[PDB]
Design an enzyme around this catalytic site. Structure first.
Site, mmCIF file in Angstrom:
data_model
loop_
_atom_site.group_PDB
_atom_site.id
_atom_site.type_symbol
_atom_site.label_atom_id
_atom_site.label_comp_id
_atom_site.label_asym_id
_atom_site.label_seq_id
_atom_site.Cartn_x
_atom_site.Cartn_y
_atom_site.Cartn_z
ATOM 1 N N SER A 146 0.848 -1.271 0.136
ATOM 2 C CA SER A 146 0.109 0.057 -0.059
ATOM 3 C C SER A 146 0.744 1.250 0.193
ATOM 4 C CB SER A 146 -0.901 -0.033 1.033
ATOM 5 O OG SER A 146 -1.475 1.154 1.651
ATOM 6 N N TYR A 159 -2.329 -2.121 10.480
ATOM 7 C CA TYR A 159 -1.964 -2.283 9.056
ATOM 8 C C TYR A 159 -0.754 -1.707 8.383
ATOM 9 C CZ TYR A 159 -3.647 -1.562 3.946
ATOM 10 O OH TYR A 159 -3.644 -1.664 2.612
ATOM 11 N N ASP A 195 -11.163 0.764 -5.735
ATOM 12 C CA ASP A 195 -12.647 0.965 -5.484
ATOM 13 C C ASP A 195 -13.318 -0.619 -4.987
ATOM 14 O OD1 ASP A 195 -12.222 -0.193 -7.741
ATOM 15 O OD2 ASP A 195 -14.147 0.650 -8.895
ATOM 16 N N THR A 196 -12.734 -1.345 -4.252
ATOM 17 C CA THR A 196 -13.133 -2.640 -3.732
ATOM 18 C C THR A 196 -14.133 -2.324 -2.734
ATOM 19 O OG1 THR A 196 -11.513 -3.018 -1.974
ATOM 20 C CG2 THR A 196 -10.837 -3.821 -4.192
HETATM 21 N N1 LIG Z 1 -8.942 -1.835 -1.663
HETATM 22 C C1 LIG Z 1 -8.045 -0.850 -1.320
HETATM 23 O O1 LIG Z 1 -8.506 0.373 -0.958
HETATM 24 C C2 LIG Z 1 -6.310 -0.920 -1.403
HETATM 25 C C3 LIG Z 1 -5.787 -2.467 -1.095
HETATM 26 N N2 LIG Z 1 -4.568 -2.529 -1.130
HETATM 27 C C4 LIG Z 1 -4.055 -4.057 -0.969
HETATM 28 O O2 LIG Z 1 -4.644 -4.793 -1.721
HETATM 29 C C5 LIG Z 1 -4.888 -6.200 -1.235
HETATM 30 C C6 LIG Z 1 -6.195 -6.635 -1.451
HETATM 31 O O3 LIG Z 1 -7.218 -5.679 -1.010
HETATM 32 P P1 LIG Z 1 -8.827 -5.834 -1.380
HETATM 33 O O4 LIG Z 1 -9.141 -6.605 -2.372
HETATM 34 O O5 LIG Z 1 -9.411 -4.375 -1.211
HETATM 35 O O6 LIG Z 1 -9.273 -6.501 0.048
HETATM 36 P P2 LIG Z 1 -10.942 -7.176 -0.047
HETATM 37 O O7 LIG Z 1 -11.407 -7.199 1.431
HETATM 38 O O8 LIG Z 1 -11.645 -6.765 -0.998
HETATM 39 O O9 LIG Z 1 -10.543 -8.773 -0.125
HETATM 40 C C7 LIG Z 1 -9.369 -9.312 0.477
HETATM 41 C C8 LIG Z 1 -9.511 -10.772 0.307
HETATM 42 O O10 LIG Z 1 -8.729 -11.648 1.469
HETATM 43 C C9 LIG Z 1 -9.609 -12.448 2.074
HETATM 44 N N3 LIG Z 1 -9.247 -12.670 3.255
HETATM 45 C C10 LIG Z 1 -9.806 -12.001 4.400
HETATM 46 N N4 LIG Z 1 -9.239 -12.457 5.542
HETATM 47 C C11 LIG Z 1 -8.784 -13.561 5.327
HETATM 48 C C12 LIG Z 1 -7.972 -14.457 6.017
HETATM 49 N N5 LIG Z 1 -8.329 -14.573 7.189
HETATM 50 N N6 LIG Z 1 -7.312 -15.333 5.409
HETATM 51 C C13 LIG Z 1 -7.408 -15.571 4.271
HETATM 52 N N7 LIG Z 1 -8.030 -14.836 3.285
HETATM 53 C C14 LIG Z 1 -8.592 -13.798 4.143
HETATM 54 C C15 LIG Z 1 -11.004 -12.265 1.507
HETATM 55 O O11 LIG Z 1 -11.843 -13.275 1.624
HETATM 56 P P3 LIG Z 1 -12.547 -14.060 2.599
HETATM 57 O O12 LIG Z 1 -13.041 -12.877 3.547
HETATM 58 O O13 LIG Z 1 -13.783 -14.737 2.040
HETATM 59 O O14 LIG Z 1 -11.446 -14.824 3.258
HETATM 60 C C16 LIG Z 1 -10.724 -11.328 0.454
HETATM 61 O O15 LIG Z 1 -10.914 -12.407 -0.935
HETATM 62 C C17 LIG Z 1 -4.479 -6.191 0.143
HETATM 63 O O16 LIG Z 1 -3.247 -6.768 0.288
HETATM 64 C C18 LIG Z 1 -4.115 -4.526 0.529
HETATM 65 O O17 LIG Z 1 -3.368 -4.303 1.545
HETATM 66 C C19 LIG Z 1 -3.624 -1.544 -0.698
HETATM 67 C C20 LIG Z 1 -3.961 0.004 -0.922
HETATM 68 C C21 LIG Z 1 -5.540 0.132 -0.935
HETATM 69 C C1 LIG Z 2 -6.950 7.926 0.519
HETATM 70 O O1 LIG Z 2 -5.908 6.592 1.219
HETATM 71 C C2 LIG Z 2 -6.078 6.355 2.384
HETATM 72 C C3 LIG Z 2 -6.237 7.168 3.244
HETATM 73 C C4 LIG Z 2 -6.369 6.847 4.745
HETATM 74 C C5 LIG Z 2 -6.258 5.401 4.969
HETATM 75 C C6 LIG Z 2 -6.233 4.571 4.136
HETATM 76 C C7 LIG Z 2 -5.996 5.051 2.667
HETATM 77 C C8 LIG Z 2 -5.875 4.013 1.616
HETATM 78 N N1 LIG Z 2 -6.215 2.511 2.015
HETATM 79 C C9 LIG Z 2 -7.000 1.745 2.447
HETATM 80 C C10 LIG Z 2 -8.107 2.164 2.985
HETATM 81 C C11 LIG Z 2 -9.254 1.385 3.278
HETATM 82 C C12 LIG Z 2 -9.056 0.049 3.492
HETATM 83 C C13 LIG Z 2 -7.946 -0.631 3.025
HETATM 84 S S1 LIG Z 2 -7.774 -2.200 3.273
HETATM 85 C C14 LIG Z 2 -8.846 -3.205 1.947
HETATM 86 O O2 LIG Z 2 -6.493 -2.611 2.704
HETATM 87 O O3 LIG Z 2 -7.938 -2.645 4.477
HETATM 88 C C15 LIG Z 2 -6.828 0.340 2.740
HETATM 89 C C16 LIG Z 2 -4.596 2.329 1.758
HETATM 90 O O4 LIG Z 2 -4.074 1.466 2.043
HETATM 91 C C17 LIG Z 2 -4.688 3.624 1.228
HETATM 92 C C18 LIG Z 2 -3.444 4.436 2.090
HETATM 93 C C19 LIG Z 2 -3.868 3.537 -0.181
#
Ligand SMILES: NC(=O)C1=CN([C@@H]2O[C@H](COP(=O)(O)OP(=O)(O)OC[C@H]3O[C@@H](n4cnc5c(N)ncnc54)[C@H](OP(=O)(O)O)[C@@H]3O)[C@@H](O)[C@H]2O)C=CC1
Ligand SMILES: COc1ccccc1[C@@H]1N(c2cccc(S(C)(=O)=O)c2)C(=O)C1(C)C
Ligand SMILES: NC(=O)C1=CN([C@@H]2O[C@H](COP(=O)(O)OP(=O)(O)OC[C@H]3O[C@@H](n4cnc5c(N)ncnc54)[C@H](OP(=O)(O)O)[C@@H]3O)[C@@H](O)[C@H]2O)C=CC1
Ligand SMILES: COc1ccccc1[C@@H]1N(c2cccc(S(C)(=O)=O)c2)C(=O)C1(C)C
Lengths: 265, 264
Positions: A146, A159, A195-196
């Site tokens: 991130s 985190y 935008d997840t």
């Molecule tokens: N989306 C964002 O705003 C951003 C995301 N990222 C990074 O991108 C990656 C994906 O994020 P994103 O897709 O948004 O997260 P999501 O919540 O949308 O999806 C995360 C996935 O991890 C799985 N998961 C949750 N808990 C566990 C666990 N206990 N063991 C195994 N799997 C698990 C979930 O499936 P299930 O719950 O069914 O197990 C899900 O498929 C992350 O590593 C995040 O740090 C980085 C910056 C910003």
């Molecule tokens: C504008 O950017 C931000 C401002 C404050 C805090 C966080 C963020 C974004 N974000 C993020 C935000 C919510 C959930 C998750 S998740 C799915 O990894 O748990 C991740 C991140 O990482 C960032 C830092 C890219």
């Protein structure tokens, strides 16, 4: 060098947290490219649906193994079974994370432990477990991070700790593989707000920032890993990679290798 | 500009004080006439340092022996130490597990231990100490490395934890700032220091010039006293420039405007 979608055709890939979000998109892109995939998450039903879709999209093969990555024993066994199903391993996309809520850190120690276990420690287990297979194939590892893994933000302390740890560990391992001439690549994907549905739900009412599309994001990670890049950046602002470039650290790390006794490699 | 009169009568906890930098910080604070409470696993070691601390002129000097692998000890240590001194003005988080230079080949249990001693125990203690630091408007010194801001090989688990400290404690600093809590957090980025441990472990591997451990200790104390965000200390004068990272500071400032002000 330029990416071709024939590079993943027939390759044996593992995608964690593949049930939804960016991981699910990555699953679909790899399936369209005609790769072999083994997916994982907790939700058995969630995986089943994605695996079905992966077959329809044109995966060579497609399997799921459900479980929690807070269990280190599961994390290790997952990689071993994944490898047995596909007959090897070419790419490892460590994408999964434990749930986190935006709040100012307050007397929250048992949560911090859990975050380090899922967001960092299991990554080490799976990379360690998978490395021999990746050595055999000259493979790659996608380490999904991130902006909060490079810079700090309020209300995301545990985190950040975990994602910072991923930058410390896998950047070191990368160097070791390089200086020991082991042909395995490691990619640290620095991602901005995507935008997840989980992310948008979380930032709701707290943070006012523009998100980027999850489909395009998933693709860049796959391209970046396939092209064996050290880091990949994905954010709305074009100022991000330049402000998070850090040429000082790169200079530091290059010259630092002269201190070492070359006989160690 | 720092003056050692500041720390006279202050109440300082120093972890990993049986040897190395922590022992030299325990000596410096004693020379300044502070109240110290020292901690390590080695009980005999602490007794020798406490005796020397009293000779050197410590307002008071006590110790509590135990491992920081255990989080229960880490927490109870702060409560006990706080009671012994009747308050807390400064917390120096310094202790680390023994590190050997080696290409990564450790199992998960070895890696877990490192994170528990190097990182997780820092969070427990800081969290535990915080109410007293709030009451005294105190400080926290989190002792990091160059390995916490840059990656060197043969030290993967070590770096991981030091990076973790930055990620975590940088955050807490900002939170304390936006919530107007007058408790400072100083991250001390240290280069090679001439301690017994470091010098023996780099033997035959790393050919580099160390820096004196006695000065090191002082510059840590000077920084935490003056409530600096970060203290850089390395032989080379090009180090603080290279590890400056202005883009991060810019990022962190401007990005505060994403937040809803009613959350604070
Ligand atoms: N989306 C964002 O705003 C951003 C995301 N990222 C990074 O991108 C990656 C994906 O994020 P994103 O897709 O948004 O997260 P999501 O919540 O949308 O999806 C995360 C996935 O991890 C799985 N998961 C949750 N808990 C566990 C666990 N206990 N063991 C195994 N799997 C698990 C979930 O499936 P299930 O719950 O069914 O197990 C899900 O498929 C992350 O590593 C995040 O740090 C980085 C910056 C910003
Ligand atoms: C504008 O950017 C931000 C401002 C404050 C805090 C966080 C963020 C974004 N974000 C993020 C935000 C919510 C959930 C998750 S998740 C799915 O990894 O748990 C991740 C991140 O990482 C960032 C830092 C890219
Ligand atoms: N020396 C150097 O070149 C460098 C040092 N640093 C940093 O400075 C700090 C101090 O380093 P240094 O003085 O060299 O380290 P030392 O090995 O000299 O001292 C470590 C101290 O911590 C204690 N300790 C070790 N393991 C544990 C544990 N399991 N639980 C509780 N206490 C423990 C030791 O006492 P005991 O074994 O009796 O418990 C000892 O007093 C560290 O944070 C390090 O990261 C940073 C950069 C360079
Ligand atoms: C020239 O500097 C270095 C080059 C490559 C790798 C490491 C180091 C030093 N090193 C360090 C080395 C041995 C033992 C310990 S210790 C007592 O904390 O366990 C720490 C560090 O940290 C550094 C980065 C200051």
């Amino acid at each position: 060098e330029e990416f071709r979608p024939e590079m993943l055709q027939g390759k044996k890939v593992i995608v964690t947290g593949a049930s939804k979000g960016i991981g699910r998109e990555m699953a679909y892109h790899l399936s369209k490219m005609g790769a072999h995939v083994v997916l994982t998450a907790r939700s058995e039903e969630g995986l089943q649906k994605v695996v079905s879709r992966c077959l329809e999209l044109g995966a060579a093969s497609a399997h799921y193994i459900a479980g929690t990555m807070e269990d280190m024993t599961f994390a290790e066994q997952f990689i071993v079974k994944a490898g047995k199903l596909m007959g090897g391993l070419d790419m490892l996309i460590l994408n999964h994370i434990t749930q986190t809520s935006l709040s100012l850190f307050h007397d929250d120690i048992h949560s911090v432990r859990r975050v380090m276990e899922v967001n960092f420690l299991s990554y080490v287990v799976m990379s360690t477990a998978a490395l021999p297979m990746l050595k055999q194939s000259n493979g790659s590892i996608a380490v999904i991070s991130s902006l909060a893994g490079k810079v700090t933000y309020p209300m995301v302390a545990p985190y950040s700790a975990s994602k910072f740890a991923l930058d410390g560990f896998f950047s070191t391992i990368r160097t070791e593989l390089y200086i020991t001439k082991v042909n395995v690549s490691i990619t640290l994907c620095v991602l901005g707000l995507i935008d997840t549905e989980t992310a948008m739900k979380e930032i709701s009412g707290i943070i006012n920032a523009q998100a980027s599309p999850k489909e395009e994001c998933a693709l860049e990670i796959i391209k970046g890993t396939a092209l064996r890049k050290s880091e990949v950046y994905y954010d709305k602002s074009p100022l991000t990679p330049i402000l998070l470039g850090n040429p000082g650290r790169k200079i530091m790390e290059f010259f630092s290798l002269r201190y070492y006794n070359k006989d160690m490699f």
